[PDB]
Design a protein around this ligand. Structure first.
Ligand SMILES: [Mg+2]
Length: 232
């Protein structure tokens, strides 16, 4: 099954093409994931020049198959179950009092590398709002991603809120609506309601002159009832 592909360190490639309000840009990322520890280490580079939106607003778009699912809830890991053929991941990201991103990605193996290929379209952003005015801090909050089954499309949906810190002490909300559907025809795991608990750390490469983001993340699945407390 697909979970077998994730028992070790897996190389990752991420490629994004974006248009936000007519600002065209591309990001390329490289690194690896080790789902055993729910761990991602990636460096992203804007290959077209300066990124026209803040790096933190792209973190959710830029591989949920690297979540650590505890053994007792392994039967709820849709993401690995769709591999290697992969899945389509679509989102609408609604920035409160501002514009929205619509994203379409395909996440799949290309040989033994896990690839996330994404098209991002941003519209109706305010020229000097928090996004296009670059008023968001270079940091990121921990949070939960709530997953539910979508049996009609043999997939999942997710609903969650990202809170981006604004440089003035306030918060820019980014409401996320997500739908994933397998690319292949084999059976997948359709989960009970549960969530992914995330933590993310953003940094810079001291030797890198291009516009870039270094990202370290841990993601753990939770929210499924077990009775293992009785064992002890
Ligand atoms: Mg603050």
């Amino acid at each position: 099954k697909g979970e077998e592909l994730f028992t070790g360190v897996v190389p990752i490639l991420v490629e994004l093409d974006g248009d936000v309000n007519g600002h065209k840009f591309s990001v390329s990322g490289e690194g690896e994931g080790d789902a055993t520890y729910g761990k991602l280490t990636l460096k992203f580079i804007c290959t077209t020049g300066k990124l026209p939106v803040p790096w933190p607003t792209l973190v959710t778009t830029l591989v949920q198959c690297f979540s650590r699912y505890p053994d007792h809830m392994k039967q709820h890991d849709f993401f690995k179950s769709a591999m290697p053929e992969g899945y389509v991941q679509e989102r609408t990201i609604s920035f409160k009092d501002d514009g929205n991103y619509k994203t379409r990605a395909e996440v799949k193996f290309e040989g033994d590398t896990l690839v996330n290929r994404i098209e991002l379209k941003g519209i109706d952003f305010k020229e000097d709002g928090n996004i296009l005015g670059h008023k968001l801090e270079y940091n990121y909050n921990s949070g939960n991603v709530y997953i539910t089954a979508d049996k009609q499309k043999n997939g999942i949906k997710a609903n969650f809120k990202i809170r981006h810190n604004i440089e003035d002490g306030s918060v820019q909300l980014a409401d996320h609506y997500q739908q994933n559907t397998p690319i292949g025809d084999g059976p997948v795991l359709l989960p009970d309601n549960h969530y992914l608990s995330t933590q993310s750390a953003l940094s810079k490469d001291p030797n890198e002159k291009r516009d870039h983001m270094v990202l370290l993340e841990f993601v753990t699945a939770a929210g499924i009832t077990h009775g293992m407390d009785e064992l002890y």
